[PDB]
């Protein structure tokens, strides 16, 4: 079982549920994704930013526990430095930076055994170009976070790693050197690597998926 | 002329002091580092957390503008990430994070040309070790903005650098491989460095301090 | 119909990634350096659960050798599709005890050795292809009489990050799994988080994913699979 | 009455980096590898400037070359405190357009050459003793044909980190300076937020810190002097 907070997060759904897992989507369309997981023969609103626990106890719930969590929800507004309101910014803090948090406080108690959790960053946190000031700040603390959190859940086989995709007119395609643009299945797949039995042995990583500008 | 928010933020005011720069001391002892500078031959109550506006005011009144900020202003509780409440959470946050975020913003706007502006981190950030989760996650938000503030400055002749030193009974002393301990003058001269006529070219580093331990 | 090489390929870990990508469907080239017969084993065992496998024996520190290889192979089976570099060594000394030869040998094999695959296959790889270089977690924890092993592979995932850029319209990836130590035992077997020792097949496994489907849009990068460790 | 080599150290940023040095109140030695001219430039300067320095050819790929580079300091002067590696070479080629010839020219001088005075400076460097290691900020650019000679530079900074905790027990901090490019011209002159070009002096400064008074608490480090370029 996999709760997957937050394109991208339909695509890390979706995936989950074809590899086999009863994915509890998480919205603040939801449906959408559900119907198409189970029409393809695959098996929960709650603001990331107390809702998080009822979000798990949901689950445990339904299913009986929580193996898999994927901190997908975040948002990115763009603004300098300069020109950056306490409004815009400590949203952007709330949602990306508190909000895993917050996922990642319940999933420190309840998650299962053999358990996997994969935070989704950015490679801006790597090219910082301007503007992505507070959206890189706010990642960054979620990448500090999986490295501390992985060594911190020792000894109950769980694994803490993150994802930073990089943008998923045609310039943008021929942007990396692979000279396409990326998917929501690119990532899907990055994600479902780290969930699956080839990233049983990945730990405390983050995995920049970008087709190579970075 | 310098701003110098928040031991570490004595040394800092005391030795940029020696320099030559007015020294803006900033507390939320204040006076006692004052005289000493004073005393010395050398030449203001916010919480970096409005009151930031009133702060750079306070000194381009005084003083006519200012040339040079140094962040030091911080908090550092240490929970694990299972056991961490919103309130020692949102805290290291809003100090560490949002004030620093603050001072920038405002930094942003009013600093002259050929500036320096030197936030404080923590080797910590790269330690990732137990407990110090939330605190190196928002430390890593300060260097992720220091890279982004240091090229959105682009035009403005002004550095944007960090500085994260380590630890400043003996064990801690042998801790680092020339096997003694930081003093707060270590981390002073790093940022004296920056601040200094040979930290001129240096522009958007994070400097760690701490003897070698990484 | 997919073809790849895997240099160092006769034990632990290049063993490992030798079984694995013929199982995914590779026709492997198992490529050793000394004596052929744990190489031969290898080979035996891919073929025994129905994969195909060559041996091929080269020193990758040389030049004409390893453009036998990348021929031997085109030759063999039409072309290089995947290239892993497994082949090191790695004596530990600190660099105030460290001989020429033994400085020498480390940088041959590890650097020069990789540095001649990659530029062989920038020339013959495939489009669609995939090349995986092995480097260390050293890189990053950087002990005391690992520092020539740790110079070499830094100067590997240099390779990795410039090639990814370098092969630019080709559809080619470039990256590279770092391995952590794999097979005071209970101590380093409590070395990571998981509190397990890592396995020739949890590498095998960062490995078969770059290689696979669901790595086609990793690459400029160093995959660190240590267990938690760095 | 304190003594460096400054390795590299006829032209632009080893030439500042001597000044300053001697400037700072060292003797400095102006290593050079080929015609002494500029050297004696550099030597002359400095006296007129009322500081102390010495010239000293060596090629410092070469074992016993440096070796004979440190006796004949400690000869003259009785010791040494700071070592300051600047020599290197940068030919441009992709990977796949290396010649063995030019991989074995920029590893042997970049790598090996810095190898030899770090394991010869292990042994003799005075306690309270300053390294610094010249990198350059490629090791994070990483653009296409830099390959080489950032892979050979990534080692020299593996080796700074590992060395600094090797000398644990000594007083002895190991750095590197990477310095981004220094003297379309205004591309490149605005290329630095800061959109000035650096000059061989910034550098100096980088270093004459790190080997200075306010330098001591930093080791194992890589500080990049290249104007906020990454």
Do not use: C
Not at 113 to 134: D, E
């Amino acid at each position: 079982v996999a709760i997957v907070t937050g394109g991208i997060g339909a695509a890390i759904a979706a995936r989950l549920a074809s590899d086999g897992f009863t994915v509890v989507i998480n919205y603040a369309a939801a449906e959408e994704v559900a119907g198409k997981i189970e029409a393809a023969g695959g098996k929960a609103q709650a603001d990331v930013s107390a809702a998080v626990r009822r979000l798990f106890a949901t689950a445990e719930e339904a299913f009986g526990g929580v193996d898999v969590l994927v901190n997908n929800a975040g948002i990115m507004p763009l603004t300098t430095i300069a020109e950056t309101g306490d409004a815009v910014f400590d949203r952007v803090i709330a949602v990306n930076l508190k909000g895993t948090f917050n996922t990642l406080r319940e999933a420190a108690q309840r998650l299962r055994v053999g358990g996997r959790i994969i935070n989704m960053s950015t490679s801006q946190v790597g090219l910082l170009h301007p503007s992505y000031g507070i959206y890189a700040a706010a990642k960054a603390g979620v990448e500090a976070m999986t490295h501390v959190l992985s060594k911190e859940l020792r000894g109950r086989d769980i694994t803490v790693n993150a994802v930073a995709p990089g943008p998923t007119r045609d310039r943008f395609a021929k942007l990396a050197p692979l000279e396409r643009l990326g998917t929501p299945q690119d990532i899907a797949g990055a994600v479902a690597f780290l969930a699956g039995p080839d990233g049983a042995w990945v730990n405390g990583q983050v995995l920049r998926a970008n087709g190579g500008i970075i």
